[PDB]
Design an enzyme around this catalytic site. Structure first.
Site, PDB file in Angstrom:
ATOM      1  N   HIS A  36       8.338   7.482  11.541  1.00  0.00           N
ATOM      2  CA  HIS A  36       8.691   6.067  11.488  1.00  0.00           C
ATOM      3  C   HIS A  36      10.104   5.839  12.011  1.00  0.00           C
ATOM      4  O   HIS A  36      10.375   4.834  12.682  1.00  0.00           O
ATOM      5  CB  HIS A  36       8.555   5.554  10.055  1.00  0.00           C
ATOM      6  N   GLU A  54      19.472  -1.610   7.860  1.00  0.00           N
ATOM      7  CA  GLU A  54      18.821  -2.889   7.629  1.00  0.00           C
ATOM      8  C   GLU A  54      19.689  -3.783   6.749  1.00  0.00           C
ATOM      9  O   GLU A  54      20.588  -3.324   6.039  1.00  0.00           O
ATOM     10  CB  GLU A  54      17.454  -2.688   6.974  1.00  0.00           C
ATOM     11  N   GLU A 110       9.137  -6.206  11.997  1.00  0.00           N
ATOM     12  CA  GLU A 110       8.801  -5.158  11.045  1.00  0.00           C
ATOM     13  C   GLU A 110       8.006  -4.088  11.780  1.00  0.00           C
ATOM     14  O   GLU A 110       6.982  -4.387  12.402  1.00  0.00           O
ATOM     15  CB  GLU A 110       8.002  -5.716   9.867  1.00  0.00           C
ATOM     16  N   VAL A 111       8.477  -2.847  11.708  1.00  0.00           N
ATOM     17  CA  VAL A 111       7.894  -1.737  12.453  1.00  0.00           C
ATOM     18  C   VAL A 111       7.064  -0.887  11.503  1.00  0.00           C
ATOM     19  O   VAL A 111       7.545  -0.479  10.439  1.00  0.00           O
ATOM     20  CB  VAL A 111       8.984  -0.892  13.135  1.00  0.00           C
ATOM     21  N   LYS A 124       1.119  -6.744   6.106  1.00  0.00           N
ATOM     22  CA  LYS A 124       2.517  -7.122   6.287  1.00  0.00           C
ATOM     23  C   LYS A 124       2.654  -8.624   6.495  1.00  0.00           C
ATOM     24  O   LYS A 124       3.585  -9.252   5.970  1.00  0.00           O
ATOM     25  CB  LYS A 124       3.109  -6.350   7.466  1.00  0.00           C
ATOM     26  N   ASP A1075      -0.900 -15.265 -43.077  1.00  0.00           N
ATOM     27  CA  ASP A1075      -0.345 -16.435 -43.741  1.00  0.00           C
ATOM     28  C   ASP A1075       0.122 -17.456 -42.714  1.00  0.00           C
ATOM     29  O   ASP A1075       0.613 -17.104 -41.638  1.00  0.00           O
ATOM     30  CB  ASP A1075       0.822 -16.052 -44.660  1.00  0.00           C
TER      31      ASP A1075
END
EC number: 2.7.7.48
Length: 2036
Positions: A36, A54, A110-111, A124, A1075
């Site tokens: 990734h 990020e 977004e990878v 995603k 009660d």
């Protein structure tokens, strides 16, 4: 990239098929991460502005340009596009993979890479694009409001590349995609290689199972395996108007009120008629039956008996008894026995008192302590009396006054005799002055105390003689000076059906327990009288009670002492405590039944007379239930009668007043002055009757639990349950079965009017209640659905830790027809042995959907501690009830803050809120509207009711829930689960009740069968079981019943709101357990009741006939209707245990207390002494110490708990002979003290109650280990080596056992395996697998020590293993007579211990341990083991001890106020860990190999997809902090307790505002040590909040100083900057509201800051009191006494020298003539004054400092020098003091009086003050300080933090988020981001030298040129914008050296290669502009001046050497790559050159 290569290299070396799974998963996680990362880096280097890491979405928006306030407003919003419940707050912090900014457009990429791209895409998108679109819409709306110049747009892209990289091109074309594809293919090949070559064959299945969830997520679940379709219920047509009309019909007639009015004339009159019924329903007696067992008599101080003194006594006794003349058969037997005893051979006499090992059998002596009496030796009458004994209803005239007078005289004489005195750690300090002096020192001389000790000796002899081999023989023991002489008889053995021990108790007549009306006779010797008591029989349960009668009585008196101190606020007077002890003892030694019922009923009688309206007559009737026989019963009854009449007469008053409830004044009706409540025993008077109830409860708990379980009560409850079942059939015959089951209808009720009865519900009423509950449940449908779906309907049934518990559970029907009574854990095994699989909760219901529910009465002798309730049921019934209760608890937890109360520790908000609404409503008025505007005034009055409606009732048709649950709005999209619950309720409707064996034998063994019993046998046709319909047999249908009751109450509320619209009647209630608290609001006329009596009359005339019940006392006709409606649902308000109150404060206080103290702590304390586990010594001492620590949890004061612990330890040290002077005392055999011996071998123990409350149970051993290891490491004392040898021997003796432990039960150290009574038989299936198989299996599948198995294959083994566990087998048979007798046996001289596999006596074990220690030698392995244990394993428990040894207690002389009783939770430490899934799952994951182990671990874990990561993290710590390795099972076992979260749901009954923090509750306990005074725990008065405040203050002062030194607007800054809860403004607000926590160097500035912002001078003047002060305070229990004999003082001083808020505690140990001066003062003058005062105080008593001359002390010291005083390590040669401990924790703030003349300086950064005009000037504070450990990287901005500076405007807001702030503050280098910097340049800024470079370009290139159109501790930032500008560059790194030729060449090349005129400079990227400026900084200065010539030379070179751009260095920093790439990304090449 290189990460893949290094992983490749590290993985290649490993040989194929050699790696365990866990490391394989780790490696493939790393490989996926790297793969990734390749694509992430590609994207970052190609397109993204981001290049390093990020950034959060909020950060990116901030970088975009939108002001912060927009984001802050957006924060509160919840996304509507996401129904799940996502909040925008969590949305901001998430980090999209990559971001880019172009104008107002923001592009987020977004990878991800996956085999199936479409999935990644859609998931995603669903996760992010929805929120992004919502943000887009919201920001567009905000722009439309004129807040933004132009709209923002979100362009969300997703790049899903195939795992093989096939679609790399289309997804993202580039110039280097080929290498990316290569890397992807290689990494995938590596995945294949590792997955197919690098794992053990046995572990492959587990590995693939792990990937199936981690990387595959392929196997799709088949729904909830589908859920069957049972028939549902169709709603019927029910309209509330029909019920309203019916009520209008039913409220038009007189209606009897259920309850009665409490009047002294009525309470007294109920007794006089119940007596006239009782005395005539029974025959009449005239001989009060005997009540005293063992009639002793003491007239002298009692010395405990001993084997030696016993001989002398017994000789003197028989010397006395022999010469008396008998007159009765008992006396004849005594005379004969004495004659035989005295005339015995010396060998017989020797063997009689010998141990069981030295015993030598003789003709007349067969067992020790016993002899044989034969017929020839006896006499005729004695023989006949023996024969009569072995060969083997009326009540007192309580009505008659003569009998009452006689019994009162007898009992009061006895109690006056027991009151007659005889003629002879931190907590210790308090226990010696408060509990000791006033309770023990006052009871130690009473005839009860000594008689209490005497009965122990008389009970020990009987217990010893009860043995199987001793019973059949006689015995004759004696006691104090031959006065009391026990004559035991040949009793029966243990056996069953009563081990009746028979004995006679001849005694000397005198004061004490003598009752000379039941004695067999009274022999007279002339000078004295001997009373021969009748033969008395005692069973075990009533022999253990007497044996510890003294201890029980003393603990009861201690609890009464505590209650009295809490109530009256002062200690009792000696007479009261003596009488209380006498009464407690007399009750203790009279463990009958009738008393246990009278006292049980008194707890409810007392509230029934201290309330306006209640039903007493039923309770008073309950008093006259069983016959009155003994005088004690009549005496207690008379005392009650008097007390109850006196209490009732107090109600003749009830004057209205005002107190102030909650936060409102509020009226009342209380009997304040002339209502003080008498006391049951003494002559004291209680302020609050709560104390009286507690006293009666203590009386009740003194009676044995055994007693409640007696055969008579079993018959009673059998008949109770059968009777109601019989009536059910009567209804089912009178009406149709369908009417009773489905339920009748309204049109039938209002045609018969008798169907409004219990066990008969109304369908319409049920439906309307359901709809009314829906009205409130319809606002939280989503929450209800989530709660229902989160109850885990799809988890294995038997794996839950509630189906494999120890609770009682009926089993299978035997052949004879009687039903077994097995335990649930057995039942799970039985079903699992014939199942082949583990079924889910719903699935098991489908299988067992045809087995009729079966139930039976629990077996008393098989009863279990965990078994609460009284009925048991089979597995199908429990499954069905679990389904129903789970469904209804999921539904009923969503109204837990409105009507019901479940948790929140123990929440009262449901009731507290209800009262608040009623209280507010009452404080008002009502105006009833007549015709016109003429109103009628009405005063609003409340009327409380407290009834237990939710409690299970014997008759309660359970079918109602069928209709109810159908309508209830669950919120689920379908009705499958609702129908499942409906069907479940349809199978628990008809049950089979199985009649017990014992009752079967009893009823068969009786001559007379009365009709009262004849019917009971008709219910069972087979004589073994019958059919019961409706009643669900005390099943756990708690929340379901509570919800049904709440629904019906809401129905009544709605019904009433419609019946009387004109009135403003208010009704509000709340439920809690069994009660409730109904609050009826009603109206009364303020006038004389004339106008209203006419309005109601005209209303009745008009036609509204339902106004005849609203004519007077409205609350009565409100409660009538409420009860009737509740009765429509078969709920019948109890007519006995109800209490109506006019809103007393006492009533509310006691009700609220009753909702917090679930169980009185007496029960627990009295339970500790009895029923010890019997598992040996360390498990008997540990168990008792643990049950005396649970009593301290339920409110028991530390002193009473300590007393209970002391008594329990004294008892447990007497069964095993471990006390000093006994046989098994360790000091006799071992070579170490009795307090320095391991507890398992018979040490002493911690013996405290704080050490046992927080630390643990076995802290003595841990302290021994720590001391021994520290000494043996720093020294080598042979004693500590001996201790370590003892511990090693214990370990060696512990590892010889079998395998059993699990997490939470790791028993380190060691434990002597005490012999345990093995049950005659063995529990079924306990031996399914051989013990050898279990051992190997456990040693192999280690994981299941932490995670319950889930497969049938590995779950049967686990359950059978749990069966073979000593603490479980002993728990099962706790009530077994064999185990009880073995426990009661004196295990002193018996072979009970196990050594080397043989049974030996404890002395043998001690000797062996001593020999081992003598021969013991240290070694590496055991030393490492001990060090690891002490440092890591027992680490969370040494923390508590260190905490409890640093707290200085101090008694501020006052009286402590008693507040309410809230119940916090003692969470060991609240935390938010960085490791999820819980340590159990994480560890169990590690030790898992088999595929089944993966399946079990993954399911049990919470976030499986992260388990591996956790392990890695868990490793880093264990090696980073501890330095140990985890890869071993043993080290993990050692360290597991250090990490495993306790998860202990501990509830402590604290009093007042006490936080839930563990330190807070421990502090409260330390404040509750003294019953009458007020302790003030010194350290910090409390030390997450404190350190957070410290950091906030540090940052506040730091920014204050910086901003004031730089002249920026600090004012707005403090409104802007935010720090984890609030902004600095709110931080200062909090500081002023609570107080600046004491600090060393920041107070000095924390005050300077506060005085210049908020205006308060509190802190600044407070610091100036530390200047100097006095006010020396004292303690109250350690004050020193004055002596004029010596002219000095004497004692242990504890003065506290208060210098403002700087304490200085001084203590003087008189014995050692020492002192520990603990202070916190840190300045010369203050500390000199401190020595002045302390030296004065020290000399006054006569003493001096521990002075000594040391050149320099190694540690911190207070060395003296000529300049003065100073703490710290010195070097200068000078004199020094000692005992000087500077603990800054003592600093504690307190209100201080006096002011100073203070003036500030330098904008308020300095302060100079004076005491007054008289005092000289002194510099008070200054800001020139340096702070450490300051958190800059947590500052956040809420508004635009504008920074106009040097006439330059900067926008620092994003820098805050960037984190570079600090650098800017400290002028430190940093690298600014590209988007953040571009936003900082939002205001136009350009480079000046660019103009001159453009001029040079024009000079050389006229055409192509730039287009510039359109234009210590003080740090001050002298640097202008150049600072932040240079953050990208490196300042002077370019340097002033330059080469003109190189510059000219580069300039010409750039000009000829690029078209700089394409675009204006103002339209470029600011960051690239800065980069190119830095590249060209200062370039033309050395060229322009001589350019006209220099260029020529350059030209020559171009035509001389043909220079190229690669051979030219500009000055010294040539960067060809960076310059070319940036220019290409910002400037295209020449158009002509592009074609080439």
């Amino acid at each position: 990239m290189d990460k893949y290569r290094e992983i490749h290299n590290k993985l290649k070396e490993f040989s194929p098929g050699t790696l365990t799974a866990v490391e394989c998963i780790d490696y493939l996680d790393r490989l996926y991460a790297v793969r990734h990362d390749i694509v992430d880096q590609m994207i970052k280097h190609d397109w993204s502005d981001n290049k390093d890491s990020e950034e959060a979405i909020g950060k990116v928006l901030l970088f975009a340009g939108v002001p912060s306030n927009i984001i802050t407003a957006l924060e509160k919003k919840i996304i509507p596009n996401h129904p799940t419940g996502k909040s925008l707050k969590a949305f901001f912090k998430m980090t999209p993979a990559n971001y880019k900014i172009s104008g107002t457009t923001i592009e987020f990429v977004e990878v991800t890479v996956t085999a199936d791209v479409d999935k990644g895409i859609r998931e995603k998108k669903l996760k992010y694009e929805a929120g992004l679109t919502y943000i887009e819409q919201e920001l567009h709306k905000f722009f439309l409001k004129g807040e933004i110049p132009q709209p923002y747009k979100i362009t969300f892209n997703v790049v899903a590349v195939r795992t093989d990289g096939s679609n790399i091109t289309t997804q993202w074309p580039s110039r280097r995609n080929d290498g990316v594809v290569q890397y992807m293919r290689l990494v995938q090949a590596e995945i294949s290689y590792v997955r197919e070559h690098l794992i053990k064959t046995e572990e492959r299945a587990a590995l693939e199972a792990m990937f199936n969830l981690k990387f595959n997520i392929s196997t799709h679940k088949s729904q909830p395996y589908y859920i069957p379709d049972y028939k549902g219920m169709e709603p019927i047509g029910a309209n509330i108007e029909d019920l309203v009309d019916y009520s209008k019909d039913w409220l038009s007639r007189a209606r009897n009120f259920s309850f009665f009015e409490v009047k002294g004339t009525a309470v007294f009159e109920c007794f006089n008629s119940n007596e006239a019924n009782h005395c005539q329903r029974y025959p009449m007696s005239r001989k009060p039956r005997n009540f005293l067992l063992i009639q002793c008599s003491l007239i002298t101080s009692y010395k405990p008996a001993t084997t030696l003194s016993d001989q002398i006594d017994s000789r003197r006794a028989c010397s006395y008894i022999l010469n008396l003349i008998p007159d009765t058969p008992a006396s004849y037997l005594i005379h004969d026995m004495a004659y035989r005893y005295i005339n015995l051979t010396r060998e017989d006499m020797i063997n009689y008192y010998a141990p069981r090992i030295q015993f030598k059998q003789t003709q007349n002596v067969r067992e020790p302590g016993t002899f044989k009496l034969t017929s020839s030796m006896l006499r005729a009458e004695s023989k006949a009396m023996l024969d009569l004994l072995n060969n083997h209803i009326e009540s007192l005239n309580i009505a008659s006054h003569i009998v009452q007078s006689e019994s009162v005289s007898l009992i009061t004489k006895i109690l006056s005799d027991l009151e007659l005195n005889i003629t002879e750690t931190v907590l210790d300090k308090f226990f010696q002055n408060e509990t000791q002096k006033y309770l023990i020192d006052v009871l130690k001389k009473t005839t009860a105390w000594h008689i209490g000790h005497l009965i122990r000796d008389i009970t020990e002899s009987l217990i010893a003689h009860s043995g199987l081999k001793r019973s059949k023989y006689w015995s004759l023991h004696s006691y104090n000076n031959g006065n009391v002489i026990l004559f035991i008889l040949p009793s029966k053995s243990l056996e069953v059906a009563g081990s009746f021990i028979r004995f006679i108790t001849v005694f000397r007549i005198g004061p004490g327990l003598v009752d000379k009306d039941n004695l067999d006779t009274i022999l007279i010797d002339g000078d004295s009288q001997w009373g021969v008591s009748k033969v008395m029989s005692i069973d075990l349960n009533r022999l253990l009670a007497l044996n510890i009668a003294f201890e029980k009585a003393l603990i009861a008196t201690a609890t009464w002492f505590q209650y009295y101190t809490e109530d009256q606020g002062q200690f009792p007077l000696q007479y009261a405590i003596r009488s209380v002890f006498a009464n407690h003892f007399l009750l203790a030694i009279c463990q009958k039944m009738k008393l246990c019922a009278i006292f049980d009923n008194l707890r409810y009688l007392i509230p029934a007379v201290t309330s306006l309206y209640s039903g007493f007559p039923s309770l008073i009737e309950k008093l006259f239930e069983r016959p009155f026989k003994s005088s004690l019963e009549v005496y207690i009854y008379y005392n009650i009668k008097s007390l109850l009449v006196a209490l009732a007469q107090n109600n003749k008053a009830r004057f209205y007043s005002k107190v102030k409830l909650l936060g409102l004044t509020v009226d009342q009706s209380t009997v304040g002055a002339s209502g003080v409540y008498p006391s049951f025993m003494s002559r004291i008077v209680y302020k609050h009757y709560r104390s009286l109830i507690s006293e009666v409860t203590t009386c009740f708990f003194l009676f044995e639990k055994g007693l409640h379980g007696n055969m008579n009560e079993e018959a009673k409850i059998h008949l109770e349950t059968v009777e109601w079942a019989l009536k059910f059939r009567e209804k089912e015959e009178k009406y149709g079965e369908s009417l009773v089951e489905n339920g009748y209808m309204m049109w039938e009720l209002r045609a018969n009017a008798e169907l409004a009865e219990q066990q008969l519900y109304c369908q319409d009423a049920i439906e309307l209640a359901a709809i009314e509950l829906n009205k409130v449940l319809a606002t939280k449908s989503s929450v209800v659905a989530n709660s229902i779906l989160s109850k885990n309907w799809e988890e294995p049934y038997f794996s839950q830790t509630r189906n494999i518990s120890l609770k009682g559970m009926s089993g299978q029907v035997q052949e004879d027809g009687h039903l077994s009574s097995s335990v649930t854990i057995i039942e799970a095994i039985r079903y699992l042995s014939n199942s082949r699989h583990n079924p889910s909760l719903l699935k098991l219901y489908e299988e067992t959907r045809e087995q009729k529910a079966m139930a039976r009465i629990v077996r008393k002798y098989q009863r279990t501690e965990a078994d609460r309730g009284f009925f048991i049921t089979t597995l199908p019934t429990r499954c069905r009830l679990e389904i129903i209760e789970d469904y209804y608890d999921a539904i009923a937890k969503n109204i837990s803050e409105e009507y019901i109360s479940y948790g929140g520790e123990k929440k009262i908000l449901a009731i507290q809120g209800a009262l608040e609404k009623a209280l507010r409503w009452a404080s008002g008025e009502s105006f009833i509207e007549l015709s016109n505007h003429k109103f009628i005034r009405m005063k609003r009055k409340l009327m409380y009711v407290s009834a237990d409606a939710t409690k299970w009732s014997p008759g309660d048709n359970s079918a109602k829930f069928r209709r109810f649950t159908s309508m209830l709005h669950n919120g689920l999209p379908n009705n499958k689960l609702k129908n499942c619950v409906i069907d479940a309720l349809k199978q628990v409707y008809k049950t089979d009740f199985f009649m017990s064996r014992k009752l079967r034998n009893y009823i068969d063994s009786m001559e007379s069968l009365d009709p009262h019993i004849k019917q009971f046998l008709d219910f069972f046709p087979d004589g073994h079981h019958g059919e019961v319909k409706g009643n669900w047999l005390q099943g756990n249908l708690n929340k379901c019943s509570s919800l049904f009751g709440v629904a019906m109450s809401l129905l009544f509320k709605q019904v009433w709101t419609n019946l009387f619209p004109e009135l403003d009647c208010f009704f509000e209630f709340a439920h809690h357990s069994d009660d409730a608290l109904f609050i009826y609001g009603y109206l009364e006329p303020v006038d004389d009741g004339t106008d209203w009596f006419l309005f109601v009359s005209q209303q009745i005339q008009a036609g509204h006939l339902h106004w005849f019940s609203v004519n007077t006392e409205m609350w009565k006709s409100m409660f009538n209707l409420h009860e009737h409606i509740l009765l429509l649902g078969s709920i019948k308000i109890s007519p006995k245990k109800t209490t109506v109150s006019p809103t007393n404060a006492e009533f509310l206080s006691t009700f609220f207390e009753g909702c917090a103290v679930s169980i009185p702590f007496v029960k627990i304390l009295l339970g500790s002494l009895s029923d010890l586990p019997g598992l040996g010594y360390f498990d008997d001492l540990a168990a008792a110490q643990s049950r005396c620590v649970k009593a301290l949890d339920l409110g028991a004061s530390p002193q009473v708990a300590q007393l209970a612990v002391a008594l329990c330890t004294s008892k447990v040290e007497r069964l095993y002979g471990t006390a000093p002077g006994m046989v098994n005392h360790p000091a006799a055999y071992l070579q170490v003290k009795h307090t320095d011996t391991p507890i398992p071998l018979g040490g002493n123990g911690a013996m405290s109650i704080m050490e046992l409350a927080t630390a643990g149970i076995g802290m003595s051993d841990k302290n021994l280990l720590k001391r021994a290891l520290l000494g043996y490491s720093h020294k080598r004392q042979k004693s500590m080596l001996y201790i370590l040898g003892l511990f090693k021997f214990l370990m060696k003796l512990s590892d010889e056992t079998f395998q059993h432990e699990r997490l939470g039960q790791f028993s380190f150290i060691g434990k002597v395996q005490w012999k345990i009574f093995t049950p005659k038989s063995e529990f079924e299936f306990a031996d399914m697998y051989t013990s050898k198989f279990l051992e190997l299996w456990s040693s192999q599948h280690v994981t299941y020590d932490y995670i319950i198995p889930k497969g049938r294959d590995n779950l049967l083994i686990y359950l059978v293993r749990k069966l073979n566990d000593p603490s479980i087998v002993t728990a099962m048979t706790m009530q077994s007579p064999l185990q009880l007798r073995f426990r009661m046996q004196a295990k002193q001289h018996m072979k009970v211990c196990r050594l080397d596999g043989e049974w030996v006596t404890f002395r043998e074990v001690l000797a062996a341990a001593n020999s081992f220690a003598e021969n013991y030698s240290a070694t590496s392995q055991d030393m490492d083991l001990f060090q690891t244990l002490t440092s890591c394993t027992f680490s969370k428990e040494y923390a508590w001890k260190d905490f409890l040894n640093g707290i200085h207690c101090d008694v501020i002389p006052t009286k402590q106020v008693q507040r309410a009783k809230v119940a916090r939770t003692f969470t060991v430490r609240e935390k938010d860990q960085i490791i999820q899934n819980s340590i159990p799952a994480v560890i169990g994951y590690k030790f898992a190999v088999t595929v089944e182990e993966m399946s079990d671990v993954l399911d049990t874990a919470k976030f499986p997809d992260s388990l591996s990561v956790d392990l890695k993290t868990m490793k880093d710590g264990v090696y980073r902090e501890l330095g140990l390795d985890i890869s071993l099972p043993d080290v993990m076992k050692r360290i597991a307790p250090m990490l495993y979260k306790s998860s202990k749901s501990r509830v402590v009954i604290v009093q007042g505002n006490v936080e839930g923090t563990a330190e807070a509750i421990c502090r409260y306990w330390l404040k509750s040590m003294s019953l009458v005074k007020t302790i003030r725990v010194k350290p910090h008065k409390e030390v997450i909040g404190q350190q957070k405040d410290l950091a906030a203050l540090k940052l506040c002062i730091e920014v204050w100083r910086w901003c004031k030194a730089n002249s920026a607007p600090y004012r707005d800054w403090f409104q802007a900057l935010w720090f984890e809860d609030k902004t600095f403004s709110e931080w200062l607000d909090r500081f002023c509201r609570v107080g600046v926590p004491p600090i060393d160097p920041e107070i000095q500035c924390a005050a300077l800051m506060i005085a210049d912002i908020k205006g308060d001078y509190s802190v600044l003047q407070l610091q100036a009191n530390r200047r100097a002060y006095s006010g020396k305070q004292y303690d109250a229990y350690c004050v020193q006494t004055y002596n004029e004999v010596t002219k000095l003082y004497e004692g242990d001083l504890r003065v506290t020298f208060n210098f403002g808020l700087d304490c200085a505690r001084l203590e003087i140990f008189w014995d050692k003539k020492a002192y520990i001066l603990e202070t916190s003062i840190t300045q010369k003058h203050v500390l000199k004054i401190m020595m002045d005062e302390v030296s004065k105080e020290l000399i006054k008593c006569g003493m001096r400092f521990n002075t000594e001359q040391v050149q320099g002390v190694r540690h911190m010291v207070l060395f003296k020098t000529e300049s003065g005083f100073e703490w710290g390590k010195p070097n200068i040669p000078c004199i020094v003091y000692k005992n000087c401990v500077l603990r800054t924790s003592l600093r504690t703030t307190q209100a201080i009086n006096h002011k100073f003349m203070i003036t500030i300086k330098d904008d308020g950064l300095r302060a100079i003050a004076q005491h007054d005009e008289d005092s000289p000037r002194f510099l008070l504070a200054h800001a020139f300080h340096t702070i450490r450990d300051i958190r800059y990287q947590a500052v956040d901005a809420v508004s635009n933090v504008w920074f106009i500076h040097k006439g330059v405007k900067l926008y620092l807001n994003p820098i805050i988020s960037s984190g570079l702030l600090e650098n800017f503050m400290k002028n430190l280098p940093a690298a600014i981001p590209p988007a953040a910097y571009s936003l900082i340049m939002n205001r136009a800024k350009i480079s000046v030298d660019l103009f001159m470079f453009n001029d040079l370009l024009k000079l050389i290139n006229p055409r192509n040129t730039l287009d510039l159109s359109g234009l210590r501790g003080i740090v001050k930032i002298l640097e202008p914008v150049r600072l932040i500008k240079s953050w990208v560059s490196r300042g002077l790194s370019i340097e002033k050296v330059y080469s003109p030729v190189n510059i000219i060449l580069m300039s010409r090349y750039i000009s000829k290669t690029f078209n700089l005129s394409t675009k204006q400079v103002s339209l470029l990227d600011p960051y690239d502009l800065t980069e190119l400026e830095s590249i060209v900084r200062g370039w033309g200065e050395c060229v322009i001046d001589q350019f006209e010539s220099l260029d020529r030379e350059a030209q020559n070179m171009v035509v001389n050497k043909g220079i190229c751009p690669e051979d030219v260095i500009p000055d010294s920093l040539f960067s060809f790559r960076h310059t070319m790439v940036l220019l290409r990304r910002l400037f295209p090449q020449d158009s002509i050159s592009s074609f080439y």
